Structure formats: C-alpha cells, structure tokens
A paper describes a structure:
With a molecular mass of around 120 MDa and an outer diameter of ~120 nm in higher eukaryotes, NPCs are among the cells’ largest protein complexes. Using a selection strategy against conserved epitopes, we obtained anti-Nup93, Nup98, and Nup155 nanobodies that block Nup–Nup interfaces and arrest NPC assembly.
We describe an anti-Nup93 inhibitory nanobody that prevents the incorporation of Nup358 and the Nup214·88·62 complex, indicating a specific arrest in the assembly of the cytoplasmic ring. This nanobody cannot interfere with the direct Nup93-Nup188 and Nup93-Nup205 interactions, since it efficiently purifies the two complexes from HeLa and Xenopus egg extracts. However, the alignment of our structure with recent cryo-EM maps of the NPC revealed that xhNup93-Nb4i clashes with a Nup205 molecule from a neighboring Nup93·Nup205 heterodimer, which would plausibly explain a failed assembly of the cytoplasmic ring. The epitope of xhNup93-Nb4i is poorly accessible in properly assembled NPCs, but becomes accessible in NPCs upon Nup358-depletion. The inhibitory anti-Nup93 nanobody imposed a late block that impairs assembly of the cytoplasmic double-ring, as well as the cytoplasmic appendices. The resulting NPCs lack Nup358, the Nup214·88·62 complex as well as ~1/3 of their Nup98-APD-binding sites.
Residue numbers in the entry: 2 to 127
The structure:
C-alpha cells in the first residue's frame, strides 16, 4: 500500500498549555476510514488516545485524556487533528496517527490500525 501519514504539531510546552496536532495522509482518500491517535512512552508502546469515525460524528478517547483532548478531521484535506488542552507532564510522549480500514466502527487497539506515521514528539515541562 502507498499510504503515507505525516504527523506534525508536536512541541515543548508548560503544564497547562495547549497544542494542536495534525496528520496529513497521502496515497488514498481517508473519507471511508476511521482514524486514530496513539502515543508511545517507555511504559506503553502505543497507548490509545483517540479515534474518530469516517464522517467525524463519533469519537472515543483514552480514559486519561477524556475531557481534555478533542479529535477532528477534514476529509477533503485528508487531514486529522488532535486538540490537546490542559497538558500534563505525563502527556509527554511521541504521538502517532493511524488508519482503521476495518469498516467496523471505532476501536482502541493498536494492532487493528495501519499505515502508522513516524510520530511527533510532545514534551510537557513540569
């Protein structure tokens, strides 16, 4: 498959700050796919963060980010977004976007996703 994902928007911020991650997809339209965000730490290789259905009407979130993060998408631009509010030191991680092409709703397990990007580093200073 010739699908390529490029995450951006990572950075170094203070506790309480906000970031807006984005991911641009090339090689295929995303308009029939669910899309997910995961994050990598020493303790979790791909911790689930968020997932959004093909039209953007539904979303699910990892327990530790509920109420703070918002996932969105723009199918015509082939882009997915993760708004991160109220950042905490334990949100420090490399953040990845990935494709769910199972056409079976929203899921939270990394092995069900494809076409991982190389991620974007988020560092939240204590």
């Amino acid at each position: 498959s010739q699908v390529q994902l490029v995450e951006s928007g990572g950075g170094v911020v203070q506790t309480g700050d906000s970031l807006m991650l984005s991911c641009t997809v090339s090689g295929h339209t995303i308009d029939n796919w669910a899309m997910g965000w995961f994050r990598q730490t020493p303790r979790k290789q791909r911790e689930f963060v968020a997932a959004i259905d093909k039209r953007g009407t539904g979303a699910i979130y990892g327990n530790s980010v509920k109420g703070r993060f918002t996932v969105s998408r723009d199918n015509a631009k082939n882009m997915v977004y993760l708004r991160m509010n109220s950042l905490k030191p334990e949100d420090t991680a490399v953040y990845f976007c990935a494709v769910d092409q199972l056409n079976a709703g929203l899921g939270d397990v990394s092995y069900d996703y494809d076409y991982w990007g190389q991620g974007t580093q988020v560092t939240v200073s204590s």
